[PDB]
């Protein structure tokens, strides 16, 4: 966060509405909350807002403040696990990084081990927060996560955080996260959802519901690398978030050190202890497979270091050695080093940063579209930075499997980009106090930045409308308004429900015509006209009728259909609709896929 929001816009000294925003609740459920965190501090706050009416359990040493207002906890039907602490307090570190994303104080020289060093914070500095832990060492169950959301509807919080989803797709009311959140938008409560972290195929991700604002995660413009310098000189770009100093160590490959019954060919993977613990003491391994922090305990205790490698390093993760995470070319590089000299070594420097370019670009691992339940629908519906964010984390948690001197944590991840969204969702909120979760969600939508198809060709099945931009959001001009009757109203067609997106489903090679109608409220008190502007691929025939729109002022509706003809190739193409009155600029993207 030290990067994120200045990389989307969003500086220290951006204009707000103190008093509303410090009377707004940000419900996070998640892993719980370390209170202790900087970035929880409430100096200066006033009590609680009279309309608050949670609780704060003390179990396990809890206490809440001014920031923290309230703190629950679930676990029902099943005794914890190893690890598990009864009570509201983050013993894991996911839920105080995730809410302090969404609303940490500012925190200066906010670092891990030096990395990220800046001013850390959240989207709404000012606001309140309640704490729902409904997730422990063995996930997060439907009976607890639905047990939160009775409650924090209940509470009266303004918006909802959940950095928690389903593996696979559940239809809607047999899923306790879309009916909870279902409920929670019938009282006005806005969900932002994670996309999940099942990518980068088709039909990954489970957060189908329609009035779910789902999110994806992209790639901001600083990329940690951590460069590694062999013996002849020649220096390698690695990616890994490496708290640990620079030091020279010799060099050992692990197709020449295998385990005992085992050989060259797999002993150069280093996993499942193919390589002779004897063999690399002291030394830097360099392993032709890339693994997690659990594998440098399992096979590879008593290596001074780990060289790994990977065909996909979009994002960097930390180790409890020092390692780095090497393209194949290079890794190539050091074995021909390895065996050009009887002595070689190594230097694994400790972590930089570079600037991407290329950024925001979808992240590998994130969850992709198309919507298994109801396919006509987009999803997800939007991307935000999720990857090497830095935020609040608790002393005590450990970082990249081992315990270090830190009160912030680098991870990637939805869930990271998730708070981001429920940030600026909520900034949106304090300046738009009774807007509707739909109204919020396409504000966000229609301002969203367009992203480049050739970076992800999966299109708006990887990225939605695009990356979130903050400060547009928050006069959006027109939004694509509804309420918890769309979403179960018969007319009852799929392409009249009033969404932010147009999405279709076809056959290959084949024609067809669709028509959507929708209906836009003016969100400013001025009046103005709008004309739509649409952008189609060959191949396609695509006209909105009207096509010009006068408002008259603040809640005044107008209708239009739009009609899609033609046909395609591919298996995703990409088009769009924005209406603009010159001062605003209303983007809606078409997609249509012959994916089944
Ligand atoms: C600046 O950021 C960009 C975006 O993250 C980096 O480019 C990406 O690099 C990764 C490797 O870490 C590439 O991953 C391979 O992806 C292919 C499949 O590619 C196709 O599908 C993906 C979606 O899954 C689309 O995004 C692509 O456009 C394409 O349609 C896969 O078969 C391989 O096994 C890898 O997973 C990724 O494709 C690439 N994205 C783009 C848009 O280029 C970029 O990284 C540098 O450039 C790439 C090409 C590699 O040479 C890296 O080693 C370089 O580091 C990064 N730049 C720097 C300097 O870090
Ligand atoms: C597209 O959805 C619109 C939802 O607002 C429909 O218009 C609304 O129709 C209501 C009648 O059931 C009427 O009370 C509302 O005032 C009106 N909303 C506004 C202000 O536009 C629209 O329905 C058609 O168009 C309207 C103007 C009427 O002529 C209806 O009889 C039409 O069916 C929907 N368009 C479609 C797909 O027909
Ligand atoms: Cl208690
Ligand atoms: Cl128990």
Redesign the pocket.
């Known amino acids: 966060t030290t990067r994120s929001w200045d990389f989307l816009g969003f500086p220290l000294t951006v204009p707000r509405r103190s008093q509303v925003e410090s009377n707004i609740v940000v419900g996070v459920l998640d892993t719980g909350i370390w209170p202790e965190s900087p970035s929880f501090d409430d100096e200066g706050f006033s009590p609680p807002p009279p309309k608050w009416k949670g609780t704060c359990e003390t179990s396990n040493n809890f206490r809440c403040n001014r920031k923290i207002i309230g703190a629950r906890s679930y676990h029902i039907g099943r005794p914890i696990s190893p690890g598990d602490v009864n009570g509201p307090r983050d013993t894991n570190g996911h839920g105080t990084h995730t809410a302090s994303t969404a609303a940490g104080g500012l925190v200066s020289q906010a670092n891990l081990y030096g990395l990220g060093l800046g001013t850390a914070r959240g989207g709404v500095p000012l606001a309140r927060i309640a704490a729902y832990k409904v997730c422990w060492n063995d996930g997060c169950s439907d009976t607890d996560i639905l047990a939160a959301y009775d409650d924090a509807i209940a509470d009266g919080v303004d918006i909802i955080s959940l950095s928690v989803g389903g593996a696979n797709p559940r239809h809607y009311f047999v899923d306790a996260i879309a009916i909870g959140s279902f409920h929670a938008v019938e009282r006005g409560i806005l969900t932002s959802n994670s996309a999940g972290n099942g990518g980068?195929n088709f039909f990954t991700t489970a957060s189908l519901s329609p009035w779910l604002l789902s999110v994806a995660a992209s790639?901001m413009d600083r990329?940690f690398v951590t460069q590694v310098q062999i013996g002849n000189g020649q220096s390698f770009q690695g990616v890994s978030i490496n708290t640990f100093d620079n030091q020279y160590y010799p060099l050992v490959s692990g197709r020449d050190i295998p385990n005992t019954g085992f050989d060259k060919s797999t002993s150069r993977f280093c996993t499942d202890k193919s390589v002779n613990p004897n063999l690399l003491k002291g030394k830097i391994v360099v392993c032709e497979a890339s693994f997690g922090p659990h594998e440098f305990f399992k096979s590879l205790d008593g290596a001074a270091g780990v060289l790994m490698t990977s065909?996909?390093?979009?994002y960097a993760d930390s180790y409890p050695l020092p390692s780095s995470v090497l393209?194949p070319n290079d890794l190539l590089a050091t074995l021909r080093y390895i065996y050009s000299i009887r002595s070689p070594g190594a230097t694994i420097f400790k972590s930089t940063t570079?600037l991407?370019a290329?950024?925001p670009?979808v992240?590998?691992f994130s969850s992709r579209g198309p919507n298994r339940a109801t396919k006509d629908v987009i999803k997800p519906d939007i991307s935000g930075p999720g990857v090497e964010i830095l935020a609040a984390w608790p002393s005590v948690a450990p970082v990249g499997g081992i315990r270090r001197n830190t009160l912030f944590n680098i991870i990637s991840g939805t869930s990271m980009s998730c708070p981001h969204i429920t940030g600026i969702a909520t900034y949106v909120k304090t300046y738009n106090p009774t807007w509707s979760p739909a109204a919020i969600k396409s504000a966000l939508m229609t301002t969203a930045s367009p992203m480049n198809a050739r970076?992800?060709?999966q299109a708006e099945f990887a990225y939605g409308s695009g990356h979130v931009n903050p400060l547009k959001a928050v006069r959006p001009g027109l939004v694509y308004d509804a309420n918890e009757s769309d979403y179960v109203k018969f007319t009852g067609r799929v392409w009249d429900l009033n969404y932010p997106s147009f999405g279709l489903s076809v056959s290959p090679s084949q024609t067809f015509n669709q028509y959507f109608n929708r209906t836009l409220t003016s969100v400013a008190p001025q009046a103005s006209t709008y004309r739509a502007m649409i952008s189609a691929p060959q191949g396609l025939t695509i006209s909105v009728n009207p096509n010009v729109l006068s408002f008259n002022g603040l809640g005044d509706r107008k209708s239009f259909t739009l009609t899609v003809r033609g046909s395609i190739k591919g298996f995703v193409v990409s088009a769009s609709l924005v209406w603009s009155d010159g001062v605003h600029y209303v983007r809606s993207p078409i997609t249509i896929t012959s994916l089944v």
């Open positions: 980068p790639t990329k065909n996909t390093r979009d393209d570079i991407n290329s950024a670009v992240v590998s970076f992800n060709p």
